[PDB]
């Protein structure tokens, strides 16, 4: 059998400095958002592609 | 990144500096616990079943890696259901009684 | 021939961990190849 | 094309620093500098200067002696200094020790750069 | 949730998401499997720990 | 005729000279994808009914 | 028919030039010239002009030599030095970097052919 994956080793354990960094790309996220949307007609969709 | 936030602040209470079989605490692979935690998923798959484990709670209990957290989200989420179920006995008897008012 | 199977199993419990070690190198490798102006990593 | 990247492996492996050549002076240029972008919209460079992280480091300006000995500048120029603080960081570009050395040396060049201009903006208007 | 959790329960999350990473991490699995070939060899079996 | 109308226009679109391996699309017969294949073709007998 | 085409292993495959021979000029033909196609609707091009992306370049046309210098052009006419700038590109039709490399030689000669056209209506007027 040849299943090789990446894993969290332990999933159930989130700390404060990685959600400080996983809010860091979502800023990134929704600053790129703001600029290739044309504003109120793929907005919406893009928030959906990142709610 | 491999501890949670509350497990990094447990080095701050006293006293870690002493060992783990000390506190309560020991390595056991043995048949005691693998019963124990053959039974604690049996359990929570027939909990699956008659609502009252969500598939939330249940993938959570399915990496843990650890017998007492998967013990306290069984508790947990019955907890969580039998208040709702509780209050939603309360607000169907008062809305009756308030058509009777 | 399961019992057979565990005579010749300690060439493949060393050969699964060379598996591990090795595609754990692939994966820092390619870590840096996309902080190279890849177009293929998108 | 080399300046301020590492070119190897079939890899572009910059070290962050964006070497701005080729063009010429403003007055050299038919298009006054090189434009590299629209923000002001006008971002004019020329041939000499170099630009790290959206900061620019002037090639026309010169490194007073007050400010090379503190700071511990080592060009001429205060774009030559830049180019001598990444010389360490052009030939390794992804490790974690040079990009935490570049960005708080290039912060040592960026406070001299902003110190030395309000010294000649003083002195012009007295 | 964590004031349903009890003191020796956190004490017990933080022991296993040390040993259930480090297990995986250097595959511990292993070194054990080797430290059993000089255990039928010498009648010793010695890890250090460091 | 052997293609359809959007796959006729992917010529159009730019660098279709690179191999399909660089845009995410390779050949594979392996025992991941005929899994894959009955896992989508039970879902649609059981999508039909119902 | 040799023009811009790649008549090989039987395919035929282009560049994207379209080289119009055979017809004649525009005062020879009786049609008014080979007819490429209905968009002006009636779009005559003759035996000289050369198309690329359904812009011509005119063999009737002079290269002045400051519009040569600069430009870098090859052929003594705008069609000639597009018949000269496609060398490449005719025999190696679906090469990434020939495509590339005709895209922006393509694009030279059209802007060249822009300014000779700008000069010459701004002479005839004054
Ligand atoms: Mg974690
Ligand atoms: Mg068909």
Known sequence: VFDFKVVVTNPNAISEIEDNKKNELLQRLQEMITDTSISEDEYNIKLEKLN | ?101 | ?42 | ?126 | DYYTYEWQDIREVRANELLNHYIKEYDIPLIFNNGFMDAMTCGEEIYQCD
């Open chain 4, 1 to 126: 094309a080399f300046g301020g990247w590492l070119n190897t492996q079939g890899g572009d492996f910059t070290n962050g620093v964006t070497f701005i050549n080729e063009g010429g002076s403003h007055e050299e240029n038919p298009y006054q500098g090189i434009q590299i972008g629209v923000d002001g919209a006008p971002n004019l460079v020329e041939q000499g200067e170099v630009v790290y992280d959206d900061y620019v480091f002037s090639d026309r300006m010169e490194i007073p002696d007050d400010i090379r000995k503190e700071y511990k500048l080592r060009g001429k120029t205060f774009a030559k200094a830049a180019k001598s603080a990444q010389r360490e960081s052009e030939e390794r570009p992804n490790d974690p020790l040079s990009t935490k050395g570049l960005q708080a040396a290039m912060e040592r060049i960026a406070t001299a750069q902003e110190e030395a201009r309000q010294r000649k903006e003083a002195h012009r208007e007295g």
């Open chain 2, 1 to 101: 990144y491999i501890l949670s936030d509350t497990s990094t602040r447990v080095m701050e209470i006293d006293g870690d500096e002493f060992a783990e079989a000390d506190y309560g605490l020991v390595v056991d692979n043995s048949n005691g616990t693998q019963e124990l935690q053959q039974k604690l998923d049996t359990l929570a798959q027939a909990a699956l079943q008659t609502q009252t484990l969500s598939f939330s709670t249940i993938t959570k209990l399915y990496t843990s890696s650890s017998l007492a957290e998967k013990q306290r989200l069984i508790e947990k989420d019955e907890k969580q259901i039998r208040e709702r179920q509780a209050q939603a006995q309360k607000e169907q008897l008062e809305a009756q009684q308030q058509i009777a008012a």
């Open chain 3, 1 to 42: 021939t399961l019992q057979s199977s565990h005579i010749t199993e300690w060439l493949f419990t060393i050969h699964d961990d060379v598996k591990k070690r090795a595609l754990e190198c692939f994966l820092e490798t390619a870590k840096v190849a996309l902080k190279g102006r890849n177009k293929k990593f998108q």
